[PDB]
Amino acid sequence: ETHINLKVSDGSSEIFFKIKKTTPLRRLMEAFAKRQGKEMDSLRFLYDGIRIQADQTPEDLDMEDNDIIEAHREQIGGSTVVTTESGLKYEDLTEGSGAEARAGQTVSVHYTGWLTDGQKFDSSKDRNDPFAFVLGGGMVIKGWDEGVQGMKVGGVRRLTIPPQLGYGARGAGGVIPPNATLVFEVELLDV
Numbered sequence: 001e002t003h004i005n006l007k008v009s010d011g012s013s014e015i016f017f018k019i020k021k022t023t024p025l026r027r028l029m030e031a032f033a034k035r036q037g038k039e040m041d042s043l044r045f046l047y048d049g050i051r052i053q054a055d056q057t058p059e060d061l062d063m064e065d066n067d068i069i070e071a072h073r074e075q076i077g078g079s080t081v082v083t084t085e086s087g088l089k090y091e092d093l094t095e096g097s098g099a100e101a102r103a104g105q106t107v108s109v110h111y112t113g114w115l116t117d118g119q120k121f122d123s124s125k126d127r128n129d130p131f132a133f134v135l136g137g138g139m140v141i142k143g144w145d146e147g148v149q150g151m152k153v154g155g156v157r158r159l160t161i162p163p164q165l166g167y168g169a170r171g172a173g174g175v176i177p178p179n180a181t182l183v184f185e186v187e188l189l190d191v
């Protein structure tokens, strides 16, 4: 009766908040922002398609248990998902600036990879260590050699990789199953 549970989805993962219906959503927004290393005014929180104001409360918005808040931490408002001739899907979430990565260059990125059920299988951020590779050199799965081309520093791009451009029927490490579609969020840090 007094409290409410809310899902916040940022496009890649979901986390839950229990909050009193009389607490301003500022506390939820600040709690979510702190996880991303950002201040809440630099994130866009939407409920039923409408931007949430910090001094609004869940009662003010007539929210109900297990409602969803959409959180956008990246820079582009209204992105588009591109499907290429290979079946690779990619979505630019932040454009970045400067030179564009091209084949033969060594690029350094941060990434997180998830299965489509939401299970994370690896993240360079969990080691606080960027990952580098020679773009186009066949040293990573094919979906990455294709999908990281054209990125600029600061750019954040979400890749959805069909298994034939990933680990295929083999899978990987007892963690990625056979024929898994792979989702990566990639931030280009240096080229």
Ligand SMILES: COc1cc(NC(=O)CCNC(=O)[C@@H]2CCCCN2S(=O)(=O)Cc2ccccc2)cc(OC)c1OC
Pocket: 111, 113, 121, 122, 131, 139, 140, 141, 144, 171, 172, 173, 174, 175, 176
């Ligand atoms: C076949 O099995 C494995 C392969 C690798 N590495 C590679 O193939 C190098 C190329 N990387 C890749 O193309 C991709 C894309 C670039 C970032 C790293 N990746 S990744 O999907 O996040 C690697 C990974 C797979 C499974 C679990 C955790 C991470 C690493 C493994 O253990 C860490 C592993 O499991 C024993």
Ligand SMILES: [Ca+2]
Pocket: 129, 130, 131, 132
């Ligand atoms: Ca490193």
